[PDB]
């Protein structure tokens, strides 16, 4: 367990060693994002013409997970702007807490502004 | 371990050695695409009768991921000239070195020309 190595680093409280084992645990969590740790998700919106393009030009690391059609008021199907949602994912590293996910005041101000 | 081999290579100097060992690690991690996480995705436009063909006659080294129908305006919404998108994928390194960027300017010209 890299967690055990991190605990041993804590016992000798070597900060560089702490950082290194936490980097190892982050690499683990990115590689083990399906073990419940950080895992990022998004949805793109495209129609078929751009759909092929950005499926083909999908980023290295982001994995396609699902496509879906959305009801098209034009004709019955294709060639409507609302054509396909594209839910994609990426196995993202989980950073051990105490060093990450630390908010800021103006960031929260803007978050409240954009929430509505 | 990647860290042990990386440090043992750095102990033997040369920057070319460092780059080549990094590329070897990226090869052994990117052929299965884990940490480099390198995956290729394609959209095959196949209609219904053809379907079982390229599903059965898929290219080896690939893996089917999703099939989605298309709204159609001919033959009761079934059997259009575009009737299904078969989103297929495969996990492997595009390059085991993780290389990018080409020095050929004519290739860039053609890429921009086909972009619009």
């Amino acid at each position: 367990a890299e967690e055990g190595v991190l605990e041993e680093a804590e016992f000798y409280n070597i900060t560089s060693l702490i950082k290194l084992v936490k980097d190892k645990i982050r690499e683990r969590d990115s590689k083990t994002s399906q073990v419940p740790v950080k895992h990022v998700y998004r949805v793109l919106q495209c129609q078929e013409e751009e759909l092929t393009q950005m499926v083909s030009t999908m980023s290295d690391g982001w994995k396609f997970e699902q496509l879906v059609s959305i009801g098209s008021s034009y004709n019955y199907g294709n060639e409507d702007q609302a054509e396909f949602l594209c839910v994609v994912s990426k196995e993202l590293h989980n950073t051990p807490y105490g060093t990450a996910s630390e908010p800021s005041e103006k960031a929260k101000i803007l978050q409240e502004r954009g929430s509505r | 371990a990647e860290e042990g081999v990386l440090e043992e290579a750095e102990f033997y100097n040369i920057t070319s050695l460092i780059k080549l060992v990094k590329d070897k690690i990226r090869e052994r991690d990117s052929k299965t695409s884990q940490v480099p996480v390198k995956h290729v995705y394609r959209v095959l436009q196949c209609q219904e009768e053809e379907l079982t063909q390229m599903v059965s006659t898929m290219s080896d080294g690939w893996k089917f991921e999703q099939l989605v129908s298309i709204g159609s305006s001919y033959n009761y919404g079934n059997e259009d000239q575009a009737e299904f998108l078969c989103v297929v994928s495969k996990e492997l390194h595009n390059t085991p070195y993780g290389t990018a960027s080409e020095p050929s300017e004519k290739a860039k010209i053609l890429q921009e020309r086909g972009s619009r």
Binding site: - | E7, E10, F11, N13
Partner: protein
Amino acid sequence: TMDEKYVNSIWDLLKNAIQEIQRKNNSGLSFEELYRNAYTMVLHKHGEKLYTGLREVVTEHLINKVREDVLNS
């Protein structure tokens, strides 16, 4: 890039390690550490400082180790 706040400590440690090697000591020194030290202290365009320190330290090794043993016997 260009900033002198950290270069002094790593520089003196690196020169001390170079002398230790000159003093026939690698049983306590890791080549990877010294190699990384030289690399980070180079790539920040401090290579003139290494060229100077290298020149003076090889001259110092010749005087302090080579010349003494040449003359003493």
